[PDB]
Design a protein around this nucleic acid. Structure first.
Ligand SMILES: Cc1cn([C@H]2C[C@H](O)[C@@H](COP(=O)(O)OP(=O)(O)OP(=O)(O)O)O2)c(=O)[nH]c1=O
Ligand SMILES: [Mg+2]
Lengths: 419, 218, 1005
DNA sequence: TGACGAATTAAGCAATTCGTAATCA
DNA sequence: TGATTACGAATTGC
């Protein structure tokens, strides 16, 4: 009845419009306001939706696989790489497609997204593409602005964007393999390109096209490749030595690939992509003893079980390398950010993120094991339930508990001093 | 349009087909209160008690409900002044003009807007004594309002104290708004924004908003 | 003025708002006092010195402490302190409502502020001083300084009171009456004035009689009046016209009685009178204020109460009068609905439940029987109440089924003698009650003469007097006075609200005494939490004495012991893994030492968390414990008063009062676990439940397998406090005062929340009672500690346990011996449920008794018991199906009507809605109704029952089974046989029988 | 001249039994 | 054409 009720109902309607492109927090707020509205008006036209399977097929159609005909209007071309597809909404989380989760993202990327959202309100959604920690604006759609200036200001913000292309067509022409090759040479990038999306000025719908063919290739072996710090990317080489790329380790352990076997693969002019959709513990243990016992799987990546050290603590804290415990305090008072982040964060969390174990496996390892402590320090650890011995990655975690307890004790008695 | 006959005045009720499954009961309820009711001069005139029964109900979306007709000069169709003198219609027209921006007009009639049916809970009232015929009309009122609610999507009730227990009077739930009466003193209806809320709710229920400026008379 | 005792407080809602006090003096004069009535707000000094228009008046309250009572979860032991501030506070009074931004203490009523800030009790005796009073009318004064006027309190003195009880009887043709077609036939009044005179009179409408009949009635002894001014109340029967009768009613209802009492009058009687008076004449019933400045018309209004469960929805309706003269219009129907729980709430059922006595047969022969009732037949006081009701009663029910008409009645010094018209009965003692009457009212109105008029007059005067009998039986006056004193509420509001309102007066007094305010900042979150612990019973039949031990006010005492209040909670420490859990436990045991702080372990709040500890402080007493202490003291007072009672009525009244205080004390804890409440504290409710579970487990561990030998008692475990180390002894070797030669063993079998059932290997009840008394003494002295105390309830014989909350037994009280009659006790079985049957109950009783007799005898050759029972049941069911001799009353079930349903389809609501659409009498929103299962007569025995809710029909008082309709015996038979089967032991034969008779698979335990 | 308020909202969980819809061979 | 489970409603015991 009052103004506040009008604002509440308006925001409820706005949230109802954008429901598939929403995270847990937005869903919870929408459910709460639905409950409030049902309570105050005794009836309302919307219900409480909980599952909400994320999908983006509304703005896309079926992928063309044959040459077709184009002619009218200016065309804007945006390429698509291989990698994980993400959705970012207006003032919302940074979610997976299909399996939307609060995926951890760099704080600089969070600040860039916040400032690009504060730049203007005319943004429906943003489509992210990821490949080996390389973050790209894949798609930026809007109902008011134009897909030209937004990528310019995002580039000036500090993150790079593909070269969106503008072309003019006046005569009836046929888009075919030759034109695909022309467009492929037209982006002029070494990154793996998959499809091309063409849009017209005025039309909100975006149509993408991709060309591919089938091939059969043998699988030789699995080898990790160096792509950063304590992170590995799997790679399989061919009998001919060709490089077959992959988006995720999930692709491998769902592909159920066997040692020395032949599989189908979508081959293109430059590179090829393995095809999925051909138990799980068998595949994970098989790949684990294939690549080598001294390895572990960190979510969608591969990682080492190395011995770490005080350098592995000093690197993240943005402080100079040193090997004396007293020194590891002075830089703490030199930078306000370092002391703030050491005070606010806990001891177990910081010592866990020192050595880069994941969350779930470490937690389920801890909650079935006995401890014996003395003055806030761990002196004895033993196992109680032997079931956790089934998963080999758990054995990889068990292999290096001593380094973790050492860094935990060091962190606790340095926190005892720096306060 | 079908006609049925009753023992007492007005001896004739003509109705739209959408009101068919209620009329029989209505008749059995009117033959026991007619003799007592028709002992007093009433506004509206007996011949105009049931003139809202000719409006179809299958194309309506909103109901704007009063509690009793004007004490004097009642036209039969609720919330109507043919010469624009009653305070309630004047102030509702002022509010709707403020909402939509129209400044120059000479009359407002809620009966012209598409999708809106205006209604009165009590169909009669003695000359100068409001709410004086509650006992005669009670059952008929419940029956007819329950029939209306089964078709519309939003029920807007004007009058805070009069409709304090509207949910007890209705069996099936429906979207309900209770607000201050226009003629209420202390200037409480001026700050009410019920019409925008109605449009928001309607468009939230996959329904067309109401062209609220359609009712102005030029 | 001078000495006055208060009767009522009430408001006026005219142009100016006032508050009124009605009182009586010693001689009998009635005095009215008028107070200006304000809106109360509480502000700080800073807000007080920044109010844009200065307030009307402000009074200083002193220095008060504000505490934030929100709860937050902490992941380590660095817990931040609670936000506490201290400031000078002001109490501002405003004639009209105001909006102040940061005002606190906003959950308390205005009348509570008046009472507490002025130091006045709603039910006290005072010696007013006339210096502060101004006379504004004859019998009405005005007070501007209530603090000085009510400064002197004096002891209580007794005063006279005035009452009007009334009933009406209306003509009808085929169903409920209608105010537009049907006139009032009879009106009956019982009148008590301030001089103690009791008058009974009945007015008869003469318009529905012939002139010769009127002349005959006048010659018989009645009085005929043509005008309102020639009516005398000293005549028993007066005949007149309808207008004169309505005018007499209007004259009576406008007087200043203390109480006008009716049964379902606010919805039928007064409504009918007002409407008919407005139809025939144009007059209205007018109420006036004590200052003669406001006038209102009688107009009954409706209050709807909704539920706090899911969907909320409406759940009750009540009707009220809008008078403004101080008279209390009381409806016994709503009161009894809210007070006790019965199958039906009609007047006949309440009369049968209330006025029943055991009677001895004195004579027989012909078609009449003579009964006598005396103090040596039933109990002390039952005969006197039966004799009181027999002064006007007409029909008596014998042996719960037979209805008889009274021929002669004599009142004795200690009982009654009655002669009834009933067939010959072969016994010596029967049970008589006042209940249903076998008269067809519609037929009587069809052919109407003088004799039926006089009989209806007698029935109506009995109906009027039943209101007074029920008013005295239930002790409404004592309950009103006690509630007004304890809840700090006006007398007319004591029976109108639930626990959330009746605890606010004492809470406000407590807060003002302690100088404390409680505030909330962030929103409240609701999580599930566990409750009491129920043990699984170890056997089914026992054949050994069982001793019942219970706690005394378990949850209130737990809250007092642990100091569980929202403002005494230091914090909640959680952990997500065992390493942090160990670190936190070691730190917590030394930061918060046991004697002053209490730590409670609980189940985790969220799936990820694996631990949760709550810490409470005990240095300063909390707010909830003080409320609980107040209510516990009230309950102790009324238990003590019950102990000294002799008559039955006083005993029942005092038992009800102590029960009410118990329920209020438990409601305080429940509110502390209620999300939409001001006293919400999730941690406190969880901790109270956890401590209760620990206490019952401790008692069960101490008692299970405990034995006494020589004069010595050995418990199973160590008497160690399960929370922390203390200074008590821990030795399980205890010296007893029992005889040396005794030797017994004790084993625990069952327990619900705060109770233990201890089995003893003995059969005699004197020895068992003595052992139980000694055990209770020893447990209270040595096992328990602080404010925890247990009681020995009873001795149970022949305990039969079906499930975790269903058992039957014979009970011997603690103050009983072997040569004393026991009590049959059923708990949760298919005899106390209001939704089973009356056929089901009788069959269950006869078959349980037969099975017990057969088990006592004992054959069990191979499967003799099962075959015998199944054959007997089949024969009985077939006979009932074929003969169809059992009436419909044995097949009626009962249910309440409401509108709190998920989904609006809901067959139950649809059934009631259709009944209301097709029938004159309407079922309301908190009303119990009867229903049954009916099917067409030609259908044969049905095996597969597919749709059952389609066959439910509502059975009103004028229902008659049609010649093409029959009771659907199949549903009742299936339920009864499912009950019987679970009692036996065979499974193959039972399954075969069930599949033959009903074509479905049974369900077992 | 043409309505507002009065008629400020409200205890918890554990266990059993019954009918009907929804999911599975 | 059955089996089995899941859910809502009613009523009772603490
Ligand atoms: C009956 C009842 C119990 N309970 C809870 C509170 C009690 O601590 C617990 C056990 O109930 P009871 O043992 O039945 O109640 P009590 O302990 O107060 O008994 P007594 O009067 O002899 O002292 O169950 C309620 O919360 N509400 C209730 O209505
Ligand atoms: Mg107890």
């Amino acid at each position: 009845t009052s103004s506040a009720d009008l604002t509440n109902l308006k925001e409820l309607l706005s949230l109802y419009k954008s429901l598939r492109f929403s995270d847990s927090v937005a869903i919870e707020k929408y459910n709460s306001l639905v409950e409030w509205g049902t309570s105050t008006y005794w009836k309302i036209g919307v219900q409480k939706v909980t599952n909400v399977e994320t999908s983006i097929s509304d703005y896309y159609d079926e992928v063309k696989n044959k040459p077709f005909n184009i002619d009218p209007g200016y065309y804007i071309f945006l390429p698509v790489y291989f990698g994980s597809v993400f959705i970012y909404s207006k003032g919302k989380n940074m979610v997976e497609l299909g399996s939307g989760n609060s995926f951890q993202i760099p704080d600089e990327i969070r600040s860039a997204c916040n400032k690009v959202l504060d730049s203007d309100n005319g943004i429906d959604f943003l489509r992210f593409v990821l490949l080996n920690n390389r973050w790209i604006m894949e798609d930026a759609i809007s109902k008011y602005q134009s897909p030209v200036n937004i990528f310019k200001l995002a580039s000036e913000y500090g993150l790079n964007i593909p070269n969106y292309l503008e072309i003019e067509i006046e005569e009836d022409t046929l888009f075919d393999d030759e034109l695909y090759s022309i467009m492929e040479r037209s982006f002029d990038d070494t990154f793996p390109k998959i499809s091309i999306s063409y849009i017209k000025l005025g039309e909100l719908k975006r149509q993408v096209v991709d060309f591919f063919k089938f091939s059969f290739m043998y699988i030789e072996s699995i080898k990790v490749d160096r792509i950063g710090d304590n992170i590995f990317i799997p790679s399989v080489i061919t009998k001919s030595g060709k490089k077959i790329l992959v988006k995720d380790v999930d692709h491998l352990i769902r592909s159920k690939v066997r040692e020395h076997t032949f599989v189908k693969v979508k081959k293109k002019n430059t590179f090829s992509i393995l095809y999925d959709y051909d138990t799980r513990g068998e595949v994970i243990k098989r790949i684990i003893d294939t690549i080598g016992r001294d390895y572990y799987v960190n979510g969608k990546y591969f990682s080492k079980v190395g011995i770490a050290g005080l350098k592995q603590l000093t690197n993240k804290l943005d402080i100079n390398e040193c090997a004396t415990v007293d020194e590891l305090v002075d830089e703490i008072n030199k930078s306000g950010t370092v002391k703030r982040k050491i005070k606010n964060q806990s001891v177990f969390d910081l010592s866990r993120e020192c050595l880069g174990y994941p969350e779930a496996d470490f937690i389920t390892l801890v909650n079935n094991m006995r401890f014996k402590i003395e003055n806030c320090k761990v002196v004895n650890f033993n196992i109680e339930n032997t079931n956790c011995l089934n998963n080999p990655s758990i054995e990889t975690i068990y292999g290096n508990f001593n380094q973790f307890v050492s860094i935990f004790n060091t962190v606790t008695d340095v926190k005892k001093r720096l306060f | 349009m079908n006609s049925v006959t009753i023992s007492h005045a007005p001896y004739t009720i003509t109705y739209h087909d959408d009101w068919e499954p209620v009329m029989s009961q209505l008749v059995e309820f009117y033959n026991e209160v007619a003799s007592w009711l028709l002992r007093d001069e009433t506004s509206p005139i007996p011949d105009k008690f049931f003139i809202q029964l000719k409006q179809p109900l299958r194309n309506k979306r909103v109901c704007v409900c009063g509690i009793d007709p004007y004490p004097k000069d009642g036209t039969g169709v609720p919330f109507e002044s043919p010469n624009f003198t009653k305070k309630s219609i004047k102030e509702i027209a002022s509010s709707i003009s403020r909402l939509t921006g129209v400044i120059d007009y000479k009359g407002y009639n809620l009966n012209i807007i598409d999708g809106v049916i205006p209604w009165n809970y009590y169909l009669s009232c003695k000359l100068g004594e409001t709410k004086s015929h509650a006992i005669y009309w009670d059952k008929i009122s419940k029956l007819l309002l329950q029939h209306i609610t089964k078709h519309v999507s939003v029920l807007y009730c004007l009058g805070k104290t009069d409709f304090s227990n509207i949910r007890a009077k209705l069996e099936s739930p429906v979207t309900t708004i209770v607000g201050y009466h226009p003629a209420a003193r202390d200037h409480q209806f001026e700050k009410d924004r019920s019409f925008e809320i109605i449009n928001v709710l309607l468009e939230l229920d996959n329904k067309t908003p109401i062209n609220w400026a359609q009712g102005f008379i030029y | 003025s001078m000495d006055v005792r208060c009767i009522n407080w009430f408001e006026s809602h005219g142009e100016n708002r006032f508050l009124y006090l009605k009182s009586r003096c010693r001689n009998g004069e009635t005095v009215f006092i008028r107070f200006p009535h304000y809106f109360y707000y509480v502000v700080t000094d800073e807000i007080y010195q920044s109010l844009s228009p200065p307030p009307f008046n402000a009074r200083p309250m002193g220095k008060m402490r504000t505490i934030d009572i929100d709860e937050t979860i902490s992941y380590n032991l660095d817990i931040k302190d609670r936000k506490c501030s201290v400031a000078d506070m002001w109490l501002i009074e405003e004639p009209k409502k105001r909006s102040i931004q940061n005002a606190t203490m906003d959950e308390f009523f205005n009348i509570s502020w008046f009472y507490i800030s002025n130091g006045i009790s709603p039910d006290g005796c005072y010696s007013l001083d006339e210096q502060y009073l101004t006379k504004i009318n004859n019998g009405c004064y005005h007070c501007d300084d209530p603090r000085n006027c009510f400064a002197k309190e004096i002891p209580r003195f007794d005063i006279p009171r005035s009452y009007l009880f009334l009933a009406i009887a209306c003509h009808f043709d085929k169903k409920f009456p209608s105010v537009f077609i049907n006139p009032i036939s009879h009106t009956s009044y019982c009148y008590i004035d301030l001089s103690g005179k009791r008058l009974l009179f009945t007015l008869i409408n003469e318009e529905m009689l012939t002139e010769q009949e009127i002349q005959e009635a006048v010659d018989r002894g009645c009085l005929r009046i043509q005008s309102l001014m020639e009516m005398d109340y000293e005549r028993e029967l007066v005949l007149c016209s309808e207008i004169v009768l309505l005018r007499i009613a209007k004259q009576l209802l406008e007087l200043t009685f203390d109480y006008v009492v009716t049964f379902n009058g606010h919805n039928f009687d007064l409504r009918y009178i007002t409407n008919r008076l407005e139809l025939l004449t144009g007059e209205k019933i007018i109420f006036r204020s004590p200052d003669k400045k406001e006038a209102v018309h009688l107009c009954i209004y409706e209050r709807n109460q909704s539920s706090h469960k899911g969907v909320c929805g409406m759940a009750n309706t009540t009707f009220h009068v809008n008078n403004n003269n101080g008279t209390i219009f009381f409806d016994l129907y709503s009161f009894i609905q809210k007070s006790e729980k019965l199958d039906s709430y009609k007047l006949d059922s309440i009369s049968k439940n209330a006025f029943s006595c055991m009677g001895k047969v004195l004579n027989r022969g012909v078609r009449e029987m003579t009964f006598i009732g005396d103090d040596t037949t039933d109990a002390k006081g039952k005969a006197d109440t039966f004799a009181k009701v027999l002064t006007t009663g007409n029909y008596v029910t014998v042996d719960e089924d037979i209805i008889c008409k009274v021929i002669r009645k004599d009142i004795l010094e200690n009982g009654f003698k009655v002669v009834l018209s009933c067939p010959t009965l072969p016994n010596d003692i029967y049970k008589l009650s006042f209940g249903k009457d076998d008269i067809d009212l519609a037929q009587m109105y069809k052919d109407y003469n003088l004799n039926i008029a006089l009989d209806m007059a007698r029935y109506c005067i009995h109906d009027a007097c039943l209101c007074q009998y029920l008013w005295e039986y239930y002790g409404v006056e004592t309950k009103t006075d006690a509630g007004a004193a304890t809840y700090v509420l006006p007398q007319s509001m004591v029976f109108e609200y639930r626990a959330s309102t009746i605890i606010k007066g004492p809470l406000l007094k407590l807060l003002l005494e302690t100088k404390t305010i409680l505030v909330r900042s962030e929103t409240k979150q609701k999580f599930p939490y566990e409750g009491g612990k129920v043990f699984a019973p170890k056997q089914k039949m026992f054949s050994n004495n069982v001793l019942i031990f219970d706690y005394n006010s378990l949850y209130p005492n737990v809250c007092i012991f642990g100091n569980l209040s929202p403002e005494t909670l230091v914090g909640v420490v959680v952990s997500t893994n065992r390493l942090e859990e160990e670190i936190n436990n070691q730190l917590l045991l030394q930061k918060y030492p046991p004697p002053r702080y209490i730590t409670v372990h609980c189940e985790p709040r969220l799936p990820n968390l694996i631990s949760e500890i709550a810490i409470f402080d005990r240095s300063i007493e909390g707010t909830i414990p003080r409320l609980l202490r107040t209510f516990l003291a009230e309950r102790a007072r009324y238990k003590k008063m019950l102990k000294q009672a002799t008559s039955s009525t006083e005993k029942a009244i005092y038992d009800s009062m102590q029960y009410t205080y118990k329920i209020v004390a438990n409601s305080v804890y429940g509110l502390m676990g209620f999300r939409n409440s001001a006293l919400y504290s999730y941690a406190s409710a969880k901790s109270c439940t956890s401590i209760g579970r620990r206490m019952i487990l401790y008692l069960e561990s101490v008692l299970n397998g405990a034995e006494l030998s020589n004069g010595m008692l050995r418990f199973a475990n160590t008497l160690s406090n399960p929370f922390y180390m203390d200074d008590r002894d821990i030795n399980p070797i205890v010296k007893t005062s029992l005889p040396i030669d005794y030797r017994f063993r004790f084993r625990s079998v069952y327990g619900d929340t705060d109770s233990v059932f201890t089995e003893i290997d003995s059969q005699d009840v004197d020895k068992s009672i003595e052992i139980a008394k000694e055990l209770e003494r020893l447990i209270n002295s040595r096992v328990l500690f602080n404010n925890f105390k247990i009681e020995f309830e009873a001795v149970y014989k022949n305990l039969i346990m079906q499930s975790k909350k269903k058992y039957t037994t014979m009970k011997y009280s603690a103050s009983s011996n072997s040569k004393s009659v026991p009590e049959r006790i059923n708990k949760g079985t298919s005899e106390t449920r209001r939704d089973v049957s009356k056929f089901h109950k009788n069959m269950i009783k006869t078959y349980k008794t037969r099975l017990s007799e057969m088990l006592s005898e004992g054959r069990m050759n191979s499967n003799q018991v099962c075959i015998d029972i199944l054959r007997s049941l089949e024969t009985d069911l077939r006979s009932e199906f074929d003969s169809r001799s059992s009436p419909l009353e044995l097949f009626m079930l009962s249910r309440m009507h409401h509108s709190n349903y998920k989904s609006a389809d809901n067959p139950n609501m649809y059934l009631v809605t259709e009944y209301n659409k097709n029938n004159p009498e309407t079922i309301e929103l908190g009303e119990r109704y009867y229903f049954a299962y009916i099917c067409p007569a030609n259908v044969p025995w049905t095996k597969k029952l597919v749709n059952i809710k389609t066959y439910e029909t509502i059975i009103d008082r004028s229902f008659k089974l049609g010649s093409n309709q029959r009771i659907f015996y199949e549903v009742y038979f299936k339920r009864l046989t499912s009950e019987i089967v679970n009692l036996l032991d065979n499974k193959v034969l039972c399954i075969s029988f069930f599949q033959r008779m009903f074509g479905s698979r049974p369900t077992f335990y």
